[PDB]
């Protein structure tokens, strides 16, 4: 699909019936509508680890 | 000592023995390069100066 479709609020259904199990099995999947941003720090290697060479 | 035998190197030691010295004996030394030289040739190198020191 397009990513606005999964971002929209519209649900998506996987409908499978089996021979032995005649009933359709509905999997209705959506993203949980209803927030912070990460602060990526990058930490450099230790001095001890470099003295191992 | 003859001047050819000093301009080679040739460490000389002076040992003295006396009844107030520690092990009763002490000694000094000199050669051409230690004592009163006309040339001081230091060559020091420091290395890993950052290190991880505790
Ligand atoms: C003086 O120091 C430099 C630098 O290490 C060395 O290359 C040179 O040979 C030295 N000269 C004498 C006379 O010691
Ligand atoms: C001074 O020391 C350096 C390093 O050991 C040596 O290469 C140089 O020849 C020395 N100078 C003399 C005059 O021996």
Swiss-Prot record, chain B:
Q: Fill in the PTM field for this protein.
A: N-glycosylated; important for IgM secretion and its localization at the plasma membrane. The interaction with FCMR is glycan-independent.
Taxonomic superkingdom: Eukaryota
Q: Which disease is it linked to?
A: Agammaglobulinemia 1, autosomal recessive: A primary immunodeficiency characterized by profoundly low or absent serum antibodies and low or absent circulating B cells due to an early block of B-cell development. Affected individuals develop severe infections in the first years of life.
Quaternary structure, from the entry: The basic structural unit of both sIgM and mIgM molecules consists of two identical heavy chains and two identical light chains; disulfide-linked. N-terminal variable regions of the heavy and light chains form the antigen binding sites, whereas the C-terminal constant regions of the heavy chains interact with immune receptors to mediate effector functions.
Protein function? Constant region of immunoglobulin heavy chains. Immunoglobulins, also known as antibodies, are membrane-bound or secreted glycoproteins produced by B lymphocytes. In the recognition phase of humoral immunity, the membrane-bound immunoglobulins serve as receptors which, upon binding of a specific antigen, trigger the clonal expansion and differentiation of B lymphocytes into immunoglobulins-secreting plasma cells. Secreted immunoglobulins mediate the effector phase of humoral immunity, which results in the elimination of bound antigens.
- Protein name as catalogued: Immunoglobulin heavy constant mu
Q: Which organism is it from?
A: Homo sapiens
State the gene name recorded for this protein. IGHM
Coverage span on the entire protein = 400 to 455 of 474
């Amino acid at each position: 699909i397009c990513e606005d479709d999964w971002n929209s609020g519209e649900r998506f259904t996987c409908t499978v019936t089996h021979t032995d199990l005649p009933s359709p099995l509905k999997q209705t999947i959506s993203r949980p509508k209803g927030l912070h941003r990460p602060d990526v720090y990058l930490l450099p290697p230790a001095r001890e680890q470099l003295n191992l060479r | 000592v003859s001047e050819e035998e000093w301009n080679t190197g040739e460490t000389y030691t002076c040992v003295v023995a006396h009844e107030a010295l520690p092990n009763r004996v002490t000694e000094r030394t000199v050669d051409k390069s230690t004592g009163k030289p006309t040339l001081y040739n230091v060559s020091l190198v420091m290395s890993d100066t950052a290190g991880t020191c505790y």
